[PDB]
């Protein structure tokens, strides 16, 4: 095929999903997996007949919640005695045991029992991304740049690197997700000198705000803040709760106990939410939702914004905690960058914009892929471009 092979890939090893991109023929491409998806769930499932990673793992989750691992990023690099490990502890259907103070996920793989450290499960995820890229490029890939949250510590960063080495990757560098995002938008290639950049990363269940000062190739973190458990899922619930309650008022019946009915309503909401990010109104219609009763209703973007007024509101607190920590005043922020799928919600953008007196938002790059884009560019730079 080609005679000018790509020298390295950039990987966004995400909590819930991972993304991989490669710079080639002067451009960066985000690579789709076997199912044609630009992102791969960071899931590893251990059946009795095999081991699944990515979409396959996600899909069968319901069938094997006990041995379908995920969220290993929340554990990677942390000590079993780590507080957060404890909070997130039983919140997972899979087991998380101790071993010399090193956590491990206990699952039943092929009859017997197995236990792996977090970096091992992440190496699996990374192997999938490594193969996804090789599948598309038509040759082996070993060089890569992997991203980690800016608040990650040396131990967390080293474990992430260990995770890549175990996967056959020659890790050129471990960089911050916000640094990767800033790189994607070229915020470092301006001539204006020193720039204060704020990255607003709002995903499905994680919220991170970062303020970096970029100057002469240096990306110095000035502050990091966020909400560990705040994301798109929360906006979905409100919609779900809203409609469930509405169903009651009109049919005096509660469907919350019908797991199939809620699943359909939740999926119909997730879709309504997405529609509300481009239209001021969304129609929710599910045939024979409960006891043969049809459900044909609707909702306005405004009504939706009301149901989550407080949550959206909270979106700005981390923004202010961060400015405070960096000893900066909102007026000193030069660039704003949006990453994270939930930043597609209009109200989320307006709130951030209005907060910065109408400053433009860097958001045209797919918020789910921005970090991957930036890592890929960084990988290419490190190899000679």
């Amino acid at each position: 095929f080609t005679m000018a092979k790509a020298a390295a890939i950039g990987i966004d090893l995400g909590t819930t999903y991972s993304c991989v991109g490669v710079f080639q023929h002067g451009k960066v491409e985000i690579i789709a997996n076997d199912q044609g998806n630009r992102t791969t769930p960071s899931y590893v499932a251990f059946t009795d007949t095999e081991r699944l990673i990515g979409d396959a793992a996600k899909n069968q989750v319901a069938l094997n919640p006990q041995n379908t691992v995920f969220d290993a990023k929340r554990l990677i690099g942390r000590k079993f005695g780590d507080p957060v490990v404890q909070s997130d502890m039983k919140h997972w259907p899979f087991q998380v045991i101790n071993d010399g103070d090193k956590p491990k996920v206990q699952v039943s793989y092929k009859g017997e029992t197995k236990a792996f450290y977090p970096e091992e499960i992440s190496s699996m995820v990374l192997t999938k991304m490594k193969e996804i890229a090789e599948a598309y490029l038509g040759y082996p890939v070993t060089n890569a740049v992997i991203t980690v949250p800016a608040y990650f510590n040396d131990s967390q960063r080293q474990a992430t690197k260990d995770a890549g080495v175990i996967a056959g990757l020659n890790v050129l560098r471990i960089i911050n997700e916000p640094t990767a995002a800033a790189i994607a938008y070229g915020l470092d290639r301006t001539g204006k000198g020193e720039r204060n950049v704020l990255i607003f990363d709002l995903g499905g269940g994680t919220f991170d705000v970062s303020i970096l000062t970029i100057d002469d190739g240096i990306f110095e973190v000035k502050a990091t803040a966020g909400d560990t458990h705040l994301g798109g899922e929360d906006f979905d619930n409100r919609l779900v709760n809203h409609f469930v309650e509405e169903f009651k008022r009109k049919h005096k019946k509660d469907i919350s106990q019908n797991k199939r009915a809620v699943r359909r309503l939740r999926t119909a909401c997730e879709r309504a939410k997405r529609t509300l990010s481009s239209s001021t109104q969304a129609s929710l219609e599910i045939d024979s939702l409960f006891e043969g009763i049809d459900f044909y209703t609707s909702i306005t973007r405004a009504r939706f914004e009301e149901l989550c007024s407080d949550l959206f509101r909270s979106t700005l607190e981390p923004v202010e905690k961060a400015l405070r920590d960096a000893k900066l005043d909102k007026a000193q922020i030069h660039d704003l960058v949006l990453v994270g799928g939930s930043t597609r919600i209009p109200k989320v953008q307006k709130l951030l914009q209005d907060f910065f007196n109408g400053r433009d938002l860097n958001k045209s790059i797919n918020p789910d892929e921005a970090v991957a884009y930036g890592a890929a560019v960084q990988a290419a730079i490190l190899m000679g471009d």
């Binding site: 199939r260 045939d287 024979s288």
Partner: protein, 99 residues
């Protein structure tokens, strides 16, 4: 005699809805074969996979937009009710008394 396809289930003929609906029907047909020959309770492997799997079709049907045409609007609902009918069969053959 009478060449007027009026069966609510197979009446949809437009372009988008017609295909997604016809696909689910084949899906439900395959699945029903497994259900019809299922043996076990609600904890059995097969019950859980057949259920969610039957639930994936319900979700597919929900993503269909009939664009208003009566025949597809009804074909979708008929298909939904068909899937729920197969679900009801799985539940009846696996349901066990409480006390």
């Amino acid at each position: 005699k009478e060449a007027l396809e009026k069966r609510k289930l197979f009446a949809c003929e437009e372009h988008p809805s017609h295909k997604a609906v016809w696909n689910v029907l084949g899906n439900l047909s395959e699945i029903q074969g497994e259900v019809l020959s299922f043996d076990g309770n609600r904890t059995d492997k097969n019950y859980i996979r057949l259920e969610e799997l039957l639930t994936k079709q319900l979700l597919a049907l929900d993503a269909v937009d009939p664009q208003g045409e009566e025949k597809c609007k009804a074909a979708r609902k008929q298909a939904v009710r068909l899937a729920q009918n197969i679900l009801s069969y799985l539940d009846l053959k696996s349901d066990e008394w409480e006390y």
